């Protein structure tokens, strides 16, 4: 829903609230680390180890508990009052950016579990927005983003 409204506007600012929901059993255990790495979206983040990523603003959720969800609210961090919908344009241009950063997810502690329970836990990632401001209408059909 957020991507379908924000695709129709040139410029967007606000707070994006990522809602993570694990689907474990009560017998799984483990921890995830969700790191926010402020920058453009073309910065190459795949070399960052886990100890380095605790520098950036992060949060750690435990898998098995009474609450499923951790809501990760990304503050607005930018050098410009707005970001821009560039996916209309063809190639990349330095200085013109859509995202405010990348959100990395690590495996903070491993996943431990007995023999008769599933060996993995799927995790939904939701998306929403608060304190949102968008303007300058346009028309664009936002294509699927593959990693």
């Amino acid at each position: 829903a957020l991507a379908s409204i924000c695709q129709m506007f040139c410029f967007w600012r606000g707070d994006l609230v990522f809602d993570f929901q694990v689907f474990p059993t009560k017998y799984h255990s483990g921890r995830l680390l969700f790191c926010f790495v402020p920058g453009n979206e073309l910065i190459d983040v795949t070399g960052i180890t886990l100890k380095q990523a605790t520098t950036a603003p992060c949060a750690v959720m435990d898998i098995a508990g009474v609450q499923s969800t951790l809501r990760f609210r990304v503050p607005w961090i930018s050098d410009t009052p707005y970001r821009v919908n560039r996916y209309t344009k063809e190639a990349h241009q330095k200085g013109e950016y859509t995202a405010i950063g990348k959100l990395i997810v690590y495996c903070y502690n491993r996943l431990t579990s007995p023999s008769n329970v599933a060996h993995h836990v799927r995790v939904n990632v939701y998306l929403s927005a608060i304190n949102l401001e968008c303007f300058a209408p346009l028309y664009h059909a936002m294509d699927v983003t593959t990693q």
Partner: protein, 217 residues
């Protein structure tokens, strides 16, 4: 008679630690003024000593295994020495200052599945463990990680040391030693995961810093 104005020759300027003594000097020329933004580009709190230097950091990451015997040392840490590193944002404060006195706060995290069983003691030991008994670790500030009850311990300790501050370049001796012992062994049935992951989060509290210095090491 009228007086015609003239430059004021001798003046002394400077900021923080620096000073300028000029014979020929002249008044400074401002333009504009500091403005406040009606619309904030970055809503997060502006960085400072307390935002950068005092945050949590991932010190050490180990694993507690079923083949560790009793009183096995799962993780031995020199806490402050690991906080002094290129990885951690506290560095940029410590790298340029000679001496610091400070508190420490540890958070140690395991993740046992309820089908495992065992325990841990995580104690803050000033200096070195030296000799004295392993049984008696409960004297030091500590917490007991129990697979049944808590997977999280937290510890807060002031600055204990024989001097005024801990000199980072040539450290005399480590201020704190964090030691994680198997308090009762890890036991599993058949098929249960054979380990637990263990991580440590450390930070400074009430950090003071002295001695700016060009020495790069």
């Amino acid at each position: 008679e009228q007086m015609i104005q003239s430059v004021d020759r001798t003046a002394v300027t400077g900021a923080s630690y620096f000073t300028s003594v000029d014979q020929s000097s002249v008044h400074t020329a401002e333009v504009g003024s500091h403005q406040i933004e009606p619309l904030k580009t970055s809503v997060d709190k502006p960085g400072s000593k307390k935002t950068q230097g005092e945050k949590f950091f991932l010190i050490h990451s180990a694993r507690w295994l079923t083949t560790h015997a009793l009183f096995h040392e799962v993780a031995k840490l020199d806490v402050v020495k690991l906080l002094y590193n290129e990885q951690f944002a506290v560095q940029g404060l410590l790298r340029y200052h000679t001496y610091a006195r400070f508190g420490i706060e540890i958070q140690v995290q395991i993740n046992p599945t309820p089908f495992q069983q065992g325990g841990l003691i995580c104690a803050m030991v000033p200096g070195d463990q030296s000799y004295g008994s392993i049984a008696s670790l409960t004297v030091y500030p500590h917490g007991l990680l129990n697979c049944n009850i808590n997977n999280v311990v937290r510890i807060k300790v002031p600055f204990i040391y024989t001097r005024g501050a801990y000199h980072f370049k040539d450290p005399q001796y480590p201020v704190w030693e964090l030691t994680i012992r198997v308090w009762s062994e890890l036991n599993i049935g058949t098929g249960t995961s054979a380990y637990t992951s263990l991580n440590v989060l450390a930070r400074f509290t009430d950090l003071e810093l002295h001695g700016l210095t060009p020495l790069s090491t």
